Amino acid sequence: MLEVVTAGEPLVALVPQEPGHLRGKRLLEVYVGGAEVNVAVALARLGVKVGFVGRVGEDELGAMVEERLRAEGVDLTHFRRAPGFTGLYLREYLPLGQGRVFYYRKGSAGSALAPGAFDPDYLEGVRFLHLSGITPALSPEARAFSLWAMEEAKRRGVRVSLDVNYRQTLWSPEEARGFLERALPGVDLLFLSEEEAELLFGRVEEALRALSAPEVVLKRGAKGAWAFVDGRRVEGSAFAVEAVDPVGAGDAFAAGYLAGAVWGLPVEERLRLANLLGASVAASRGDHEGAPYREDLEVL
Amino acid sequence: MLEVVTAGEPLVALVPQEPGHLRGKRLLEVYVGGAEVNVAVALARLGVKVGFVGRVGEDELGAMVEERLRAEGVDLTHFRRAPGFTGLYLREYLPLGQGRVFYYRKGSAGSALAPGAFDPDYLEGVRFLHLSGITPALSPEARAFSLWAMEEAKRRGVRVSLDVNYRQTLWSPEEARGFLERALPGVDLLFLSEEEAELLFGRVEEALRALSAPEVVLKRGAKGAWAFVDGRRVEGSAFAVEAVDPVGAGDAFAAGYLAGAVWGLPVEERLRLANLLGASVAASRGDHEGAPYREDLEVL
Amino acid sequence: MLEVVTAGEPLVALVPQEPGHLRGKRLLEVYVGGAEVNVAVALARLGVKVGFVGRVGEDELGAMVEERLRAEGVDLTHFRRAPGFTGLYLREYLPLGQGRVFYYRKGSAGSALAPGAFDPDYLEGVRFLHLSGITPALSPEARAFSLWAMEEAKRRGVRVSLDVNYRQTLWSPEEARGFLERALPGVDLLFLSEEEAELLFGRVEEALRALSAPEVVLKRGAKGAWAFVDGRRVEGSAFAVEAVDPVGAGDAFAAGYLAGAVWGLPVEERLRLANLLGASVAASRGDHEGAPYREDLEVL
Amino acid sequence: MLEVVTAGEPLVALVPQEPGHLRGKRLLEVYVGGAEVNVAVALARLGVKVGFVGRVGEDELGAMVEERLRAEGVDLTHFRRAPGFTGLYLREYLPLGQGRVFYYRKGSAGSALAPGAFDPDYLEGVRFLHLSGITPALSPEARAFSLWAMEEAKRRGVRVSLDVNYRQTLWSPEEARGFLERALPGVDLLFLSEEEAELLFGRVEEALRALSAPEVVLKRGAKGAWAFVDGRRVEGSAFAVEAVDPVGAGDAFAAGYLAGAVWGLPVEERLRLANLLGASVAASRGDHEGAPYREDLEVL
Amino acid sequence: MLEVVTAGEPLVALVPQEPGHLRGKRLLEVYVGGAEVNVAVALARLGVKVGFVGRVGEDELGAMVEERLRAEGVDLTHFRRAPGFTGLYLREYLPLGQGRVFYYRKGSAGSALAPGAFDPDYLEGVRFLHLSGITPALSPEARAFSLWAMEEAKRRGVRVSLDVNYRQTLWSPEEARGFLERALPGVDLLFLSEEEAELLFGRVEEALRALSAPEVVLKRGAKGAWAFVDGRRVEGSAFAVEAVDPVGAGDAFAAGYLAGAVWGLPVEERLRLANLLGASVAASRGDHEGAPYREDLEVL
Amino acid sequence: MLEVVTAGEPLVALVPQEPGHLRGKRLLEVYVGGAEVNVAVALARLGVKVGFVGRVGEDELGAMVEERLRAEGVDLTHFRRAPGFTGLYLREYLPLGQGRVFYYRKGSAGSALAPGAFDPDYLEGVRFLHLSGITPALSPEARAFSLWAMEEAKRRGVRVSLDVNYRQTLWSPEEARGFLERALPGVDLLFLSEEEAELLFGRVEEALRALSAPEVVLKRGAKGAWAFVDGRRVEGSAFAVEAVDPVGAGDAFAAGYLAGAVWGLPVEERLRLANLLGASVAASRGDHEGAPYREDLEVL
Ligand SMILES: Nc1ncnc2c1ncn2[C@@H]1O[C@H](COP(=O)(O)OP(=O)(O)OP(=O)(O)O)[C@@H](O)[C@H]1O
Ligand SMILES: Nc1ncnc2c1ncn2[C@@H]1O[C@H](COP(=O)(O)OP(=O)(O)OP(=O)(O)O)[C@@H](O)[C@H]1O
Ligand SMILES: Nc1ncnc2c1ncn2[C@@H]1O[C@H](COP(=O)(O)OP(=O)(O)OP(=O)(O)O)[C@@H](O)[C@H]1O
Ligand SMILES: Nc1ncnc2c1ncn2[C@@H]1O[C@H](COP(=O)(O)OP(=O)(O)OP(=O)(O)O)[C@@H](O)[C@H]1O
Ligand SMILES: Nc1ncnc2c1ncn2[C@@H]1O[C@H](COP(=O)(O)OP(=O)(O)OP(=O)(O)O)[C@@H](O)[C@H]1O
Ligand SMILES: Nc1ncnc2c1ncn2[C@@H]1O[C@H](COP(=O)(O)OP(=O)(O)OP(=O)(O)O)[C@@H](O)[C@H]1O
Hints:
The structure is a homohexamer.
Chain A: E1 4-7, E2 11-16, E3 27-33, H1 35-45, E4 50-56, H2 60-71, E5 79-81, E6 88-90, E7 102-104, E8 128-132, H3 134-138, H4 140-154, E9 159-163, H5 173-183, E10 189-193, H6 194-201, H7 204-210, E11 215-219, E12 225-228, E13 233-236, H8 249-262, H9 267-282, H10 294-299
Parallel strand pairs in A: 1-4, 1-8, 2-6, 4-5, 8-9, 9-10, 10-11
Antiparallel strand pairs in A: 2-3, 6-7, 11-12, 12-13
Helix pairs in contact in A: 1-8, 6-7, 8-9
One adenosine-5'-triphosphate is lined by residues 35, 165, 193, 219, 221-222, 225, 238-239, 241, 243, 246-251, 253, 275, 278-279, 282 of chain E.
């Protein structure tokens, strides 16, 4: 019996070995990415029973994705390689921090996801259902799917977890607010970053009042992150580390909190766990390569 | 005063360090490809005054392409980085030789090429105009452009050189025949491989009769290649070498022939030069990394 | 419902990037090996329902093995990480071909295998049971297990497949003959190489007469391999390829044969399939990295 | 005439290129390790005349060890490749610091060392004899050897230097105390870490009183280290550096102090030198790759 | 119309992948260096129209240099591969910071530069002419050239920019002062480091009074750098970064200031820009690999 | 008691990882070369007591050379690091086989060698003295030294072994003939390749008549090599292998012959041994990395 179920579009990340403009690189590292994918693996590595819903192309990259998910022990009952191609993107980290990403995923097999992409009875007995704001922003079908998904979850007593994850590349602030404004009602746990709230509601303050969900978690980068549960405002501090490749850390952060929730842990321990995973991934290259295993926590 | 002018869509090649299925690779080599791009560089390296017409995206890969073309001394008077993205592809070489290519170029800035993409007075005094069958196969605009291009060349007394380079991925044998049957009249030099003729005209025989251009060159892989000039059938033998990454060899072959023609060399020396370039690139990784320089010929 | 079930000791292979004495290497490639492990994966890749029986240590290498087997879709119902360590070895390929292997497996968790290591009802409805002569050579428990295993298979109507795979390191020619002379009766399909037969029965002739099993397959290296079925002697030719890392090729060969048998294919096609897998793995580094997938055969 | 003589079991270290669980690595760095080996080379690099006593297997790894020791200018008068194998181990550094090591050395040629392993007249005129608590913990023979070694040294007026180096993997705290309690009398210089004293005598305090040797040096990690000589308690501060691969730093620390002693340097300069070497090795990968040369000190 | 013109000897830098004595490295990174070369590329990357005057050998390294300069968009109107060889050097970074460089450039094609090495009309309309104290120190011809160069610049209303860049390897402090004492009159902008002034004029104070040029810039390492313009003493602070490979940072620093000057920017913004480029190159390996592009500033 | 003594200039070889023009490489492999250095190591590896006479610079590369020679067990009684620099060179292997070497050795510490560079009583009881035609070609001092060296050997009853090893880069065919015509009298064993004899005496025939030494060995590349001893003409065949990096093979060949001679082996076995070493080094990268050890012969 699964505890958590996530869904979205898997992606392959192409990253240079060191900082510097892409144009000057001659070799690239291949990684398996995708917001929800990162969360899926992070959870699995911690022993949480998780399944991943999505599609990939019938190509080598799609296969690559499938192996990783399978190798990591993720439930792929409703995951499969379908006609089409698997999306990819190229990251670029500059000497002084400023990065830039180039996508090649439009019209991918994974961006198809529409209402009914999987059997609802899958969400039976499931603790949480996790989705990212990236999914609905991909297409009209994806947006519909997302809404549909969290509706069948609520109907089955499945808490809905959402990570805003606003992408300026996918949709405009209004389109994003338009969605949130519509989806918010079915959300139980909301993950939001400072910049996002700022970029969508002017200031972190308003955002919190507008997006008032049962449990909101405001990621403050290294400044830790706040947990707004029962009117209470718990604070959590990030782990002092040297940010290597900050990509995928927010997803890892989410996974740490969910695991904590799944295990019915105090808000203090849920935040602690979340910041731990976010730091590990942040201090490692790849999309989710730094994600720790249960055995690591046990030892720490 | 340019001698040769080529045009088409530039591409970035992602190739693994060694043979094996893509899905198992963790690092990939970045190369600048594109049929006519390979030809452009190969000719420049030999000291031939050549210009390249085309567009790339306003991204890092498009920039990368720009530098290589500029570094190699290709005239980019009508080349530029325009809005959009630069197409790329992923090659895969299997243990026993069978390869497989994955494209990510649909809707790229380079696939735009339409009639008038450049100033015709550019072709003034130019010896040859080189185009590949890949260009017209990309889009209705590109096909129109190609036709337009060789029309403005002919009217400027510029010989038209064409390398069939049939791609099953771009169009069907009939669509290809349909094009050739239409373009053939304006072609002065035609490059064709044995498989292509067989895949489009049943047998190498018919193809040669149907596609009877002033000068046809049939590439026979390692079996050399035949030159059909003045009813005469000159034969040329390939250089004994160990095929490393056969990609881009045909383009390199064409470039060697053209240089020979540009230099008014006998058919014997044109074929010799062509097979030399084809062998060099074949015996090296990347799309055109093996192309030799003038100084190499001088010494050899 | 499984079709094939194999068992033995999994191993991790440490191989240098290129030829040369080990003592001069500064970096080594990590691979998951083990005769029956190679066979298991090769079959899974071809779509054959296969399960793997064995143990590994509760360490990181044992975990690594577990993921690969799981990622590849092998049934690990009776496979698990138990106390102890996972065995490993170091290969060394010299400039002129002569290699040398260094083991670090004595007393490993995988060398434990004894009678009853798994539930016999696992072999219910299974087509074949595959074992290598390496297993019984490890310890008195392993030898007993092997005998026990093929006994429970025969009583379940499960054909027994064996690959002599004689290791001078594990036991003497007499000890090996002693085993075969004892096990032979329960064997249905026997895999044997020319050197082995010669090293154990003087000449390939005698060996074939002494080891007369229902179906014997004599691997002749590149000289193909002969299939002795119904008194008939079918011949098969190997695929012309450049041997990169010949390790694991024999295991891959067996897997190709079994798949052919499982699919009820003519001896012609069984040998064809077997030589195909052997060539692929031979032409690639690692213990079973070159094994092809079903989709590759379909296309070829 | 040698100044310092050390002895023990040499080891080969297999380390990943970056942090992360071993199970996910595909390439490993090969290094020559072994506590006493690290000290031997560190000393040699500083111009100190040092000899190394020990055995390795008659394999490629044993050979590798021999080259390094020879290349580094260590006296191998009583070092040799003997029948058997050379031990090795695999390190693993996790994203957030927690590491884990896996050994493959039980029954190695190096763990044989017993009383009389070398000619005592070797220690004639020698300044110090260095041994680690790892040696005696290997086997009953090794423990006997160790005791025997420091006895023949004392008899020849050779100061005995000992680095507790307690390994929970080799023996229990009591077995360790049992040894120390017996060996202590012949020790002249004792190296001990905070954790060790804590793990063996409850608190750093007791340990110091129980293990009261002429000169004790308490390594405090980055907190420097204290030198307890003539009732005096000199303090030394560590060099601000980014710990890369902390392995082998304690050995390097010891070597720096010994060199200082060998050169009859003030306790302030002995500590300074020791912390210097510990920092260098700490800030570099491998077991002793960071060890500085005399020319480096000269310049600093 | 060019804005800035620099000249000197190009060099190829051979650097190890990590810290440690050269003697122990088995692989080296190849980079294109040369003070003035670093400045040339840095400027070009920022969109400044710059030309480079110099020679390289008719070898592969000389060719390598030419490609980079061309690829980077530097004007090579008076740059060319001439008979002779291209100089190179080998860097070595030690664990605790202390480095050491080994040169192989004496008698190189680039060290030839003498009066009239290029057409003076080249400096027509040019904003600045940049030279390093390395050039004149190479040979009597180079020293003469340098003096000659800044004379034809002044005559054409071209401001002279000079980076002391004192090399103890090339000439003695007196020879250096002898030059400065003679060249100073024609200098408009002077770049000087703290150590240099100290090593040549006793204390930073004297140096500033002796070398009183219209605009002097004192590089203080990480302590930023001071700008002495109109009697005014503007201060600038360096960007907090982890010095990777500090080589080429001073050149990058100069380039940032020049660009700022070329763009007629306030002294505050000229210093800001300079410290920015110095930090980027400092935080990256190679001679000028970290140099940012205009697009980076635009974004920051 | 040494058996063989060789002398010359040591060199460091910089080689790319794969074929291709140098200008396109970003990483290079570092190797220790030098004709007589290759011979010295090859012999030491075979257990032959050999000493090496020469000098290197007081730099890191000179140190590197020193370690290898010491690590390999070569007697360096008359070898040392002296003021100056250690020479190096850059190799380049093209796709189709044609290579090209770039030197950086002129005026090196090793090119100093003059008469009396070492104590003649060193050659006491020594079997052979080996020198290459590269040594005398370096400078007038080196040529004098070489003559001097073989003179002191002859007077000590030490057979003189010489490998023409003609370098077009060092001196002209006449200068080489001039030397040989002068040195020949003191030569006992002469190593010569087909191209060399042809390039110096028109045809292999004349050369053999003119250079008639007690024992001449003509290397025929892969066509084996002929041994002209007692008027007898023994023939030897090369080992079928895939030439990787043919550099240093001739030196390795000489070493195999010498060892055979030193061991008083028949001409049949001397040639067999020689071709074996030549093949091994040919089939491996570096200057002498492929040289086998005694233990390899024993086993083979
Ligand atoms: N250096 C760091 N040290 C500790 N935790 C960090 C660090 N960097 C990021 N994190 C963790 O990651 C979470 C922040 O992630 P962030 O706000 O950057 O979203 P994101 O990572 O950019 O989203 P994505 O992963 O999709 O790119 C924080 O709340 C924090 O717990
Ligand atoms: N091993 C080889 N030795 C010598 N020449 C070769 C070799 N392989 C290819 N060539 C040269 O390349 C030309 C053949 O190229 P080919 O027929 O394979 O088209 P292609 O290379 O596949 O087209 P593309 O370069 O776009 O992939 C031949 O006519 C020949 O001159
Ligand atoms: N170069 C090759 N080309 C084609 N097939 C090959 C090649 N090398 C090996 N094989 C295949 O592998 C089988 C031979 O394997 P082999 O006799 O060498 O046992 P093995 O591979 O050494 O056993 P193991 O895999 O455990 O090391 C052959 O029968 C053949 O089909
Ligand atoms: N970051 C650091 N900076 C400076 N010195 C350090 C650093 N890390 C370790 N050291 C030096 O190493 C010595 C500490 O070593 P430590 O206590 O960690 O034993 P150890 O290194 O773990 O033993 P081993 O080398 O066998 O693993 C200290 O006393 C200190 O001088
Ligand atoms: N860690 C750093 N952070 C920020 N800026 C730095 C850093 N290191 C160097 N710089 C910049 O580089 C300039 C200093 O360079 P520096 O004084 O070291 O000359 P240099 O770099 O050694 O000369 P060269 O580049 O030829 O080796 C400073 O003024 C500063 O702006
Ligand atoms: N492929 C090969 N197979 C077997 N032996 C070879 C091979 N290549 C070279 N050799 C051996 O090397 C000797 C030939 O060396 P060669 O004539 O090429 O001089 P060289 O190697 O070029 O000199 P140097 O080593 O200084 O470059 C031959 O006589 C032969 O024994």
